[PDB]
Symmetry: D2
Subunit: 300 residues, 4 copies
């Protein structure tokens, strides 16, 4: 539990995941959170020096070969989350979409994420209750409904654990409606607010000041939103900046290129310069630590 500085004992708290996340928010300006699809990606991000990582719901579906249409369940997300937290103590924020069902299912989701050593979740106000043959769409639940979802989650969560509420109201209802929802969500007990990228950076101050709690700005590619730098967002009062799919979009282009090279040429020579070396892989895996551990404890 207790670390010390230099030679003499200072006070160190052994920190829950949620506490680590909140500290990462408070200590960064702003905290950049990067999407990672698997444990190996989280380790790459840790190595580069990110202080928080993210498990995207669309990433979970897409990596299973599925469209992001709400087909996946708590177990799909939970299993990918567990694999990442087994490999790193870097605070992990997990997408739980609409909570996967009613009050007790949201409760289960929260408790299971906490047991999986997750730091934070984000839950959104999209409609869940969809008729069997309903088309892919974005409708919002009523404000009261999302408050109930938040109430369900906060009822079971520990103090430290972070609930980040997301409203999808902006694209369809405009900035004023978005702020009203977000504020109701804070009143219901949301710890932080997750915001789609606003078209005008000078609207963030108004957003952030109204909601009070820390605001996350979602910087995805190939959407509608333009791309501001972390600095600019911070200067406008944003505390977290998320890069949800950036890494995996790039991985997919690379995999396809290798596959095409092998198929065209009957060999992967042309791909060699674009592969991580075995040596870099050994280093990210911290392979030496395994040798050193065996030598420390056993035969050496």
């Amino acid at each position: 539990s207790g670390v010390d500085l230099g030679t003499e004992n200072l006070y160190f708290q052994s920190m829950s995941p949620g506490k680590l996340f909140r500290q990462a928010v408070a200590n960064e300006h702003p905290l950049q959170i990067v999407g990672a699809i698997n444990a190996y990606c989280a380790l790459l991000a840790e190595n580069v020096g990110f202080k928080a990582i993210y498990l995207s719901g669309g990433g979970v579906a897409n990596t299973l070969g599925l469209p992001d249409l709400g087909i996946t369940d708590l177990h799909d997300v939970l299993e990918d989350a567990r694999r990442i937290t087994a490999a790193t103590h870097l605070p992990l924020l997990v997408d739980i979409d609409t909570g996967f069902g009613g009050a007790f299912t949201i409760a289960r989701a929260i408790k299971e994420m906490e047991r999986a050593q997750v730091a934070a979740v984000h839950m959104e106000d999209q409609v869940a209750q969809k008729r069997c043959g309903h088309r892919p769409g974005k409708e919002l639940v009523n404000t009261n409904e999302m408050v109930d979802r938040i109430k369900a989650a906060v009822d079971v969560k520990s103090n430290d654990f972070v609930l980040i509420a997301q409203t999808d109201a902006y694209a369809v209802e405009g900035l004023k409606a978005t702020i009203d929802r977000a504020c109701t969500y804070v009143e219901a007990g949301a710890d932080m607010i997750f915001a789609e990228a606003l078209e005008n950076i000078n609207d963030y101050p108004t957003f952030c000041k109204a909601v009070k709690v820390p605001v996350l700005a979602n910087m995805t590619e190939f959407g509608k939103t333009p791309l501001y730098t972390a600095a600019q967002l911070a200067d406008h009062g944003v505390k977290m900046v998320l890069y949800p799919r950036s890494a995996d979009r790039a991985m997919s282009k690379a995999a396809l290129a290798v596959y095409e090279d092998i198929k065209k040429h009957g060999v992967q020579t042309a791909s060699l310069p674009f592969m991580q070396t075995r040596e870099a892989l050994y280093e990210v895996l911290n392979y030496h630590a395994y040798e050193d551990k065996l030598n420390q404890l056993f035969k050496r």
Copy 2:
């Protein structure tokens, strides 16, 4: 209606040689399918490494089985799965075979490395006795269906030389192995002797950054190789790409510089076959 194993065997017979590419997850298997591979591969080192673990036999049947199931749910392309040393004794090997068959897997490869039996044993690859690997093969063949393909891998060459390697491989065929998996031999002109002696189809392992050099599929085939495996090629490139995006975001405070190197939304939609979902709903519902 084709069994997985039958699809794999047909891919072997009908390609010259059959190229088998590694895929770490279902999305990768779909990319490979899209490019037009006829068979795909789930690497044991890939399973471990993707979990943040070294390839030291820490992972078990469940780790590999879960990755296998996710791939086969997304594609009928025949999948060859690394089951390492079989994960335990005869009944564990039996469970591994039955579970891979239930997961719609087509083939496995099992190797003749020693199972790390001393608690604090150092990372190393020695061979089990020939008779031990025969037992492993016997365990697997006892429960497998006819169509399902067992590929036996001997690591004997590096430490025993070409003559001993052929002798092992042949004993493994006699025990019931369908096909033989060879570490890439120092010299392509070893393969003819190898391949002709063992009789059954031989797989050559074309990994990068190893000891083996890289021959073309044509050259391997001309030397009597029936399958060529590319176990980690795609995954190595994914990792470099991911790290570069992470460095870009960290250095520049934004991912602009990475944009040219990302798959577009439209290509992602196409690989996911997103339209087919819309089309399916339109076909069945709302009259």
Copy 3:
């Protein structure tokens, strides 16, 4: 694939799970299907000589320490189903409740059950779309909605696989409404019909003749329904009789008794007569077959 009779070769089909189930229906009068909560229970039932077994949705929840309120998902049910089918080829009927979501989730559920070597599922017409704070209740979806659920399932299922549709209309809508729904469900592509126990056995002929396809009667305890024998139900045209929780109710009383004995007495002597012997456990596990297998293949 091919078995023979006596000495000479007769024609044998290697049968898919669904085909085994349909044959078990056709060959029994009626087919008794017993609930089993885990693989060891399925083996006990197989040993006694049942020809089909059942994985109850309430059983799955209750065994996890949860109420039967729709908290569990496809993975909870799927994992328990896989464990049972790994242990026995006896055709297994699995409760998938409302299908766990919309069209593609029902599709996933069907495909995953087929991959798990399941023979049949039953899906019911209870409302799924429930607001976050909705109370435990039984409302039916509209007939059209359940038809869509059936359409989703039949669209992906293999020929052999059996879809059994359940209407919960009876308790709240009466016999006439129940028959109307059931018939619409057959028209949508349901293979068989799953029926709560009717209060009067002489209503089954009307039920069974209207729906045409094989009818399963659900014989649970401690409900409203009275208990008819399998013979009587068959004589009234019922093809399957289900005993969903009977075994587990009895297991639970027994476990509690052992726990109380140990707690009261500081020892389990009084419980000994009510325990299965180690020898019977070895026999159900077919432990000898393991010894015989090792001796056949190896050192002997």
Copy 4:
């Protein structure tokens, strides 16, 4: 806020002796909790047998971990889990410890049986060398938290006698085992010597239908035993009950005769604490 391990240690210190009962699933753990046990147990043989498998080391970390997680999700009662021989080498043991800790497990027991290393090895229980078990313990203690409890089990008695058993057990304590798990000794008057030598708390295993006879908890305590385990007692009774219901239904065409032996809906509702769900919804919702 109590760690699982701390709750377990307190249960040991505060009971005389602590009775630990086997539970195969979460519903059983809730039954045991309701009766008022202070600690519960997940048996490795129970894990296998419930999957339809013999207790021959076929199951892996995932089989046991999944059963453990389901129990701990339903109760905070400290759970002791059988991890057999640790499921592999040092890093597998490390993974087992870390994963049990993440699953909110309180304690494990690990035994000094040989890990079945030859493929076609016959069912048998021999001991590993003392040094091998020390390595196993070293691997586990290296990653475990302070509070988490490691119980070392020596099977030495049957084959080595009382003197050798004490010597092993003591070496295991020196290696870092928190507590010691003893197969029931032929004679209750062996325990005092055993317990006094090893120093740390000793668990006595009260299984049925074995070689061991059944002493009362009082008698064991008076001989210096700190914990008494009832590993399969409930499960054996469940199986007899299930089979009887199955035979009744099959013989009689109906389950009438079984009704008196079933838990009532009302008792099931109470163990599930069904009312608490209604009360929770009423507390939070609809104003």
